[PDB]
């Protein structure tokens, strides 16, 4: 009896205030494209995942559903009668019995905010009402003989988007929330389609909703639909990466600084798999630092596990565990064991490391490191030599890299220059590889080019800041 | 005697860490494991050494009698708290903490320290008991008590008694305050050595000045170093006392090199052979080698390495492989030429390094500004 | 000892004599200003996050 009533209060009041203020903002002002309660949906990314998972069988949350699905609200007297009915639909939990809507009363409850003479002028209340059945069901994480019910509720949510496409779409811009809803549902729905085979019908309606946007509206929905396309495009990533790069989808722009990070991660892996490493490293580092708000959120453990993989494919050697965290130090242990081998030149120990932990490397989604990595087993070494010796000979490099034949030792140099690892040139009168130095970085108009972009971005921050201001 | 109780850690680390290669030092620790130590860890060495025989007999026999001597003034306070002063007087454990923290084992002596922390609010005895607790943390290499209570020792009791208690907060050097980072904090605390006469702690003030002159090499190259170690009366006095360490200093200050390498080997003879080798002195030897190569390589634009070999010692190919490691490590900025035996140095002018630093710092600041802009206003 | 502002040349026996670079004092103050501004924006992030 102490566990029930306080969730019954705070988890009545947060969403009562959210629904009331969302309807009041979306109708009182027409400029509610980015309302205050939009951040409330950000709270719903983090609230209900730790607030309640099951319907709280000690008479707490099972009564929240039939009250919040009984909404008629014709005018002010019907809404006031709903406020009067709130006391009884509140006390029915704590006094007698919360009704057992045990994982099934979500399908005939679609017409429940149409029963008892309901009018639907606020579409986002129906969007939140279609968002609610995933709270005791897909946020309970069971996935046992239950899949068809979330697919049915998602078809009802699709019918809600058809209602947003056909029934009174007079500049409501509710899709700017609904696509965010089509974020969260179609996350775990994706997990459902992760459990079964390829999501071809999801591919078709994802493309259809991707081109349903842009011409209609464009704010943070097309980015989410693009990313939800591209993740399972990258699942069976066979030849569609050329399609994804020729997919003109750099549009995203504002993405609350979180979705843009994983979009950068996805296109970084696409560009990393196609031998272009130097362009991949900068966008990998950009995606790593874009949203590091919390430590080891799963995303960091994977972008950090791709980052110095592509950096070791480039040739530069950082140590991996320099951000020792609760789930960084012990999760990157064979990662550190592999990155210790590239500084050395032992191939047998590296092969023993790979054969010892090849199952974990296949678990990381990084099958194809080895098919290129042996090239860097020589290449990194010669760049270190090209960093150490400004003028190296032709015969000393044979014993400085244990490359046996002097012609074989002097042939990697005939590739590393051409793709570009070292400025040095070779001449066949001495057999000496020698490089020059750069002094003109500050002497020429190199700093002005970077400074113009920095100045433009910094001064435009002031304009964007002042453009959102005082609202008396 | 909690102030002479650091004999426990001192001789227990004088044997127990080099006990893998200490023969006579086992016999040295034999008449101090039984005769004067805290408690049951006098057994503990049988997990490393032989089974032990005789210490089971006497050490229990005194200790229960000492527990029979632990009635002491407790019962005398029970017949002496009849006076209604403070419902207490300075007779009992508050004046009996010397046994229970000297002879008490840390699993119970930590609770004894907490018991005598429930005590008078006088700052002097409180600061003394905190220094006793810091030494008790250094007894068993706990590495958590010497982290937690040092903040209490330095900051929390910093309301009085200063400018003369500060020569007892010098334990924050070699302790969890100053780990193997033998650098600016540790050398700054060690350079506040305005004293000659002994104050226990590490024993044998010559060892303190050798520790200070060892941390001075990793402290500074020569920004005003000649005043702080070379031109000082007491440090030159103990340098007159200790000849080989004076040779180690003057083979670097006079820039003689060569024999400096020999002194490094002599330093190796006590780099790991002391007690404090459970962390490695590799970040000292490599740092000294890089420091010596930096002071040689300065004022020589095009130096042949044949001169460098005779300047530092032997090992032309050793010089080559050492520079090949150290240049590509990132430090010691020069560009060795394998042919023509020239080691040419390049140094960045002070407009390009400043440009790179401004670009990097401005990049992280603009990223932070854009993140803060995205936090508010959606 | 920073008494003389030149650099020797060892194996050629040449004493290179040259001056010292002046100015480069704006950039140091700029770098310290940017670090101090990082402290300022840290405090601003704290103020913004406390009351949302």
């Amino acid at each position: 009896p102490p566990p029930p009533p306080a969730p019954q209060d705070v988890e009545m009041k947060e969403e009562a205030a959210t629904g009331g203020g969302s309807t009041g903002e979306a109708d009182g002002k027409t400029a509610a494209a980015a309302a205050e309660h939009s951040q409330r949906e950000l709270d719903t990314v983090t609230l209900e995942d730790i607030k309640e998972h099951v319907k709280q069988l000690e008479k707490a949350v099972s009564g929240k559903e039939p009250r919040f699905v009984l909404r008629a609200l014709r005018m002010l007297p019907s809404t006031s009668r709903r406020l009067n009915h709130y006391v009884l639909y509140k006390a029915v939990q704590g006094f007698f019995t919360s009704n057992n809507a045990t994982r099934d009363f979500l399908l005939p409850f679609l017409e429940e905010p149409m029963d008892t003479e309901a009018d639907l002028q606020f579409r986002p209340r129906t969007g939140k009402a279609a968002s609610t059945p995933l709270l005791p069901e897909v946020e309970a994480y069971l996935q046992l003989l239950v899949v068809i019910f979330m697919m049915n509720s998602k078809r009802y949510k699709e019918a809600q988007k058809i209602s947003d496409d056909l029934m009174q779409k007079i500049s409501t811009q509710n899709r700017r929330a609904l696509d965010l809803v089509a974020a969260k549902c179609y996350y775990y729905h994706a997990r459902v389609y992760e459990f079964l085979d390829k999501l071809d019908v999801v591919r078709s309606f994802l493309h259809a909703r991707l081109r349903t946007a842009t011409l209609r509206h464009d704010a943070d929905g097309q980015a989410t639909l693009l990313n939800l396309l591209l993740r399972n495009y990258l699942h069976y990533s066979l030849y569609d990466q050329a399609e994804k790069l020729v997919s003109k989808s750099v549009f995203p722009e504002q993405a609350n600084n979180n979705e843009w990070a994983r979009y950068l991660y996805y296109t970084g892996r696409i560009k990393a798999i196609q031998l272009e490493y130097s362009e991949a490293r900068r966008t990998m580092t950009n995606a790593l630092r874009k949203a590091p708000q919390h430590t080891a959120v799963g995303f960091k453990q994977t972008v950090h596990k791709l980052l110095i993989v592509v950096e070791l494919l480039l040739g530069e050697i950082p140590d991996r565990l320099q951000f020792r965290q609760p789930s960084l130090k012990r999760s990157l242990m064979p990662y550190f064991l592999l990155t210790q081998a590239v500084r050395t030149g032992n191939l047998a120990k590296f092969n023993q490391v790979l054969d010892q932990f090849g199952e974990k490397f296949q678990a990381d989604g990084t099958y194809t490191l080895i098919i290129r990595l042996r090239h860097n087993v020589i290449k990194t070494g010669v760049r270190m030599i090209s960093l150490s010796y400004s003028r190296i000979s032709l015969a000393d490099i044979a014993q400085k890299l244990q490359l046996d034949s002097p012609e074989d030792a002097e042939f990697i140099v005939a590739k590393a220059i051409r793709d570009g690892v070292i400025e040095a040139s070779i001449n066949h009168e001495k057999g000496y590889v020698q490089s020059k130095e750069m002094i003109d970085i500050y002497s020429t108009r190199e700093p002005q080019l970077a400074f113009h972009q920095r100045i433009s971005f910094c001064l435009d921050i002031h304009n964007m800041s002042v453009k959102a201001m005082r609202f008396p | 005697p909690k102030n002479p109780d650091l004999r426990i850690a001192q001789l227990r680390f004088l044997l127990s860490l080099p006990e893998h290669r200490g023969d006579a030092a086992v016999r040295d620790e034999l008449m101090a494991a039984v005769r004067d130590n805290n408690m049951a860890p006098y057994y503990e060495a049988l997990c490393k050494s032989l089974d032990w025989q005789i210490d089971v007999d006497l050490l229990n026999k005194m200790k229960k009698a000492n527990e029979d001597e632990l009635k002491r003034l407790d019962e005398e306070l029970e017949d002496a708290e009849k006076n209604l002063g403070e419902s207490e007087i300075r007779d009992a454990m508050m004046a009996k903490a010397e046994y229970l923290c000297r002879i008490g084992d840390k699993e119970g002596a930590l609770t004894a320290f907490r018991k005598t922390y429930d005590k008078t609010v006088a700052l002097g005895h409180r600061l003394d008991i905190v220094f006793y607790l810091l030494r008790i943390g250094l007894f068993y290499m706990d590495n958590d008590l010497i982290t937690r209570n040092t903040e209490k020792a330095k900051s929390l009791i910093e309301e009085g008694g200063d400018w003369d208690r500060r020569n007892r907060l010098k334990v924050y050097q070699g302790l969890y305050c100053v780990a193997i980072r033998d650098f600016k904090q540790a050398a700054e605390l060690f350079l506040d050595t305005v004293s000659t006469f002994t104050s226990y702690e590490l024993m044998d003030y010559k060892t303190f000045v050798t520790y200070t002159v060892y941390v001075s090499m990793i402290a500074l190259e020569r920004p005003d170093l000649r005043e702080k170690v070379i031109k000082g009366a007491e440090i030159l006095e103990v340098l007159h006392s200790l000849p080989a360490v004076r040779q180690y200093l003057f083979s670097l200050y006079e820039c003689r090199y060569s024999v400096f390498f020999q002194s490094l080997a002599v330093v190796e003879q006590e780099m790991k052979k002391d007690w404090l080798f459970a962390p490695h002195y590799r970040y000292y030897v490599r740092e000294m080698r890089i420091h010596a190569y930096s002071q040689l390589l300065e004022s020589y634009r095009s130096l042949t390495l044949g001169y460098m070999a005779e300047a530092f010692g032997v090992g032309v190919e050793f010089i080559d492989q050492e520079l090949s490691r150290f240049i590509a490590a990132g430090r010691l900025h020069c560009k060795i030429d394998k042919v023509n035996e020239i080691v040419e140095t390049n140094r960045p002018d002070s407009k390009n390094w400043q440009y790179q630093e401004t670009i990097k710092k401005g990049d992280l600041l603009l990223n932070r500004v854009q993140k803060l802009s995205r936090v508010i206003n959606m | 000892d920073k008494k003389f502002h030149g650099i020797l040349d060892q194996g050629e026996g040449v004493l290179i004599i040259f001056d010292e670079p002046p100015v480069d004092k704006t950039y140091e103050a700029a770098l310290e200003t940017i670090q101090n501004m990082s402290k300022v924006v840290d405090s601003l992030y704290n103020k913004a996050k406390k009351l949302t």
């Binding site: 920095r454 100045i455 001064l459 800041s465 | 500004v369 | 940017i34 501004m37 601003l44 103020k47 009351l51």
Partner: peptide
């Protein structure tokens, strides 16, 4: 460039000051 950088954080300070002192005031007033 440093002038633009020293201007932007002042603009951001004014923005978050206005937003906090507005939202708390409308929390009181409503």
């Amino acid at each position: 460039y440093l002038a633009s950088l020293i201007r932007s954080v002042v603009a951001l300070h004014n923005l978050i000051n206005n937003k906090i002192a507005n939202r708390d005031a409308e929390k009181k007033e409503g």
